[PDB]
């Protein structure tokens, strides 16, 4: 198993985005020295809940400030861009960190972006997956000639051409089981979403495996991703309650006719959140849903930067032990 | 005065992409300890006179691995892109960097890429202010709510928030009278391209002063900018001839045959090309034909490594001296 870092970045009234910002900075830089794989980037836009709109573009500057980790966006949302713009940044990110970036795509997941960027709400399916095929294209030809009712245009090439063969790395995100079937029949991983419950997930688990298994499409090289929150306090309750308030309006505003508190209670009792014990049998349960291989976490909700150094430390030190 | 050095990134058969990219990322890490203010970002698209086509992602990578130096995108064109999405990169950059990103932008020059990115032609223009009092809005007050032919969609909190009070620094490409004079009443500060000539960056220079003095514009603290290609050598005809060929492609794709050698020779003989002493002569005339404050240098031309660094050493020798 590998793991890695995600930073969801979310702001409230004790933590404002210039802080947020810093404080991402600050554990990059930490933990760039210890044996965590992987960066990861997650995107919002116009809420408290994700102050970071352009992850390629944090992406960037991380990767210009480390040196061992990989850094990726976790769910770059492609549908609400010009794909031959996003396959510009991706092999300019690819060729400037050497092969230390990784593509993490997304379909559109609220509404309220799509009948804001102006795009087609009714064939919003048929439009990510033909973005999808003109990067696709740039990534491994270095050109694209698309000839389709979204996108008319000549044979144009992008440049720089990749620097890794067929493009940085690609993972998309579990989102519906139109993009799981469809994640299936390619062969492109997918990265599990900690908002989701783990009936949920063994549900995409499984539809990915019996579509891939029925195309006839080889997923034993495939490596699925997980992210979780993280939250380790020496009293379990008092983790639960301080994650209760991180989580308190992502709730409201994604989950808004669910039922507050039977999801606020699930995403605190599914996620690594209590006693080092809790914690961790939580997590194991999680992979075992779904057959991650490799593990993300969000050490964030934790806001007493000595805590969140210890917890984060200890991740650290079974990695070592165990997993070397 | 102040210096600084830009990159255009040009390449051609004898020298790939991959190439110019890590000589980029070298010459910044050289030049960052270095005098130079400044290290400025060219955008293009779709062709070999131009390999970045995001500046902004560029920008960020070279923030997280310079300390010293500010980084700016020399010519960003805003005009075929959501204006929502450049604030929050722009702003992403500001508070990353803690106020050392620049934003220097641009319009659109030519209308194949306006049809490219559906954009309205013959508004080119209009398009292009509408989207910039979006952005500055955004800088400004963090909030942004247009109401007109191009853009219209209630109230949104673009996030973050600037770092920079007001936004981080801006500039504009003095590309056209009407961006000039548009410029003029704004009292923003201009950066003249290394492509004119000196009667054309004259006639712009006058042209501000002109509209400044008579919209009661104070641009007495305005600093304005000037581009130029460096090529010395021991010998004034071995530099000429090199950087002839760098020229060669983009004087063709550009200005097409406006007699392919006239432009050429204006070029060779208006930029700081030639021994040290022809060089220098030549960037002095520059200089007075236009007013500009600050310069902004590309030694790229330079095939030879050695022979570059010993260019960029002596100008830095003489900031060190005389400009200190």
Redesign the interface.
Known sequence: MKFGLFFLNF?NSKRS??QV?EEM?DTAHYVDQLKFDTLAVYEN????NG????P???A??????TKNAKVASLNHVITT??PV?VA??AC??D???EGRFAFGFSDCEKSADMR??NRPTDSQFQLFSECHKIINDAFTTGYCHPNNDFYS?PK??????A?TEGGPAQFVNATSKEVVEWAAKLGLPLVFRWDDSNAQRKEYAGLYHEVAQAHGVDVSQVRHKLTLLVNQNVDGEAARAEARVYLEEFVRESYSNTDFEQKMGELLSENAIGTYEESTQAARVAIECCGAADLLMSFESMEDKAQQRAVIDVVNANIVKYHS
Chains 1, 2 share one sequence.
């Open positions: 702001m985005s210039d910002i900075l836009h116009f809420s408290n102050v970071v709109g352009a390629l573009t944090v960037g500057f991380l990767l210009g400030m861009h010009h713009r510009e940044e300019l990110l060729q400037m960190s804001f960027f245009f144009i090439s992008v440049n720089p051409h620097f």
